[PDB]
Amino acid sequence: MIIYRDLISHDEMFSDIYKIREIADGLCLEVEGKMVSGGITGVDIVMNHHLQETSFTKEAYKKYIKDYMKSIKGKLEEQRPERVKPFMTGAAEQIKHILANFKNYQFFIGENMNPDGMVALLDYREDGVTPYMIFFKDGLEMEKCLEHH
Amino acid sequence: MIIYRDLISHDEMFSDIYKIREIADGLCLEVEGKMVSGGITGVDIVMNHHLQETSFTKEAYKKYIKDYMKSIKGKLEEQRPERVKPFMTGAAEQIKHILANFKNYQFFIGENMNPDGMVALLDYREDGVTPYMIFFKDGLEMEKCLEHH
After folding, report:
1. Buried-most residue among A32, A55, A119, B128 (CB within 10 A)?
2. Cα separation, A42 vs A22, whole angstroms
3. Interchain CB contact of B49 with A (< 8 Å)
């Protein structure tokens, strides 16, 4: 299995039990979930990794995402400088889209709700039933769990 | 995350995203799943780890489980001899129950369908909707995936 963790908060965000693909020129990972009927109707990604639904006002989100982008920029400068300009430019466009469509998404954070961690988006496919979630790829750290005996 | 793999086949059987408890005096792990409606109705454990439904006749199963018990006994003799008698005695009782209730379970094997690997059982809770699966604990190997940076 491969575990995808929030770079900043260390919370596990998802794993490769889901269909995953890169979107937005490598800026984002799209993670397709399943609707669960057993117990309480919900999105398996959210239940499985204990993601917490969150809310905020646009002014709060603007303050948060500016600091988040700074944190990721500093990590990319230190470790992968070739990603700094694509991330800053691509993320700015994604963030403008989010703010223009703000009431149309649900927002989730890792189980431990660290304010400096990543906020992920939940949307549904055009079939109205299939959920999927969007994450900043530069804000994730992979752990490969392949029988490190 | 913690990954539970078939000792013998190496296939991943489940992980600790599910509710897990020990049953039958430590002989078995019980793994509670969720029903999934998105796409094709099924049990998330089965879909997530690509478990394969299997069938057989009682005579085939009797031949298989006798060899499987031998394989696990040999592993316990070599590595955990204090488990040999509890496993052989406890498994014999579980197997008699399975054979007496043979048409009432669904049987699953790991993704790669190794004939020497573990066969897991799928049942439903008394609510008729909540699935759960039963595995021999002595036939599993844990991998702890906890940020081995």
Report:
1. A119
2. 24
3. yes
Chain centroid to CA A28: 8
Q: Tokens representing B142?
A: 């844990």
How far does the CA of residue B119 sit from the closest CA of chain A (Å)? 21
Task: Name the experiment that determined this structure.
Answer: X-ray
Contacts of B131 (CB under 8 A, 6+ apart): A38, B32, B33, B34, B35, B43, B45, B122, B123, B124, B125
- From CA B49, how far away is CA B111, in angstroms rounded? 7
A135, HSE (Cβ side, Cα atoms, 13 Å):
29
The amino acid sitting at A64 is Y
* Interchain pair B1, A130: CB under 8 A: no
For residue A11, the one-letter residue type is D
* Spatial distance between the Cα atoms of B121 and B136, rounded to a whole number of angstroms: 10
Sign for the pseudo-dihedral over CA of B95, B70, B66, B50: positive
B contact test, residue of A1, A5, A13, A16 with most B CBs within 10 A:
A1
Question: How many angstroms is the resolution?
Answer: 1.9
Closest residue in B to A147 (Cα) is: B143
Q: Amino acid letter at A70? A: K
Q: Where are the alpha helices (DSSP H) in A3-57?
A: 44-48
- Identify the bridge partners of residue A18 per DSSP, sorted by sequence position: none
The interaxial angle of helices A84-100 and A58-79, nearest 10 deg, is: 170
CATH class of B2-144: mainly beta
C-alpha of B6 from chain center: 8
Q: Rounded CA gap, A10 and A143, in Å?
A: 11
> If you measure CA to CA, which chain B residue comes closest to A145?
B145
Between the CA of residue B50 and those of A19, B43, B108, what are the distances in Å? Answer: 13, 11, 10
Give the strand pairing for B119-124 and B131-136.
antiparallel
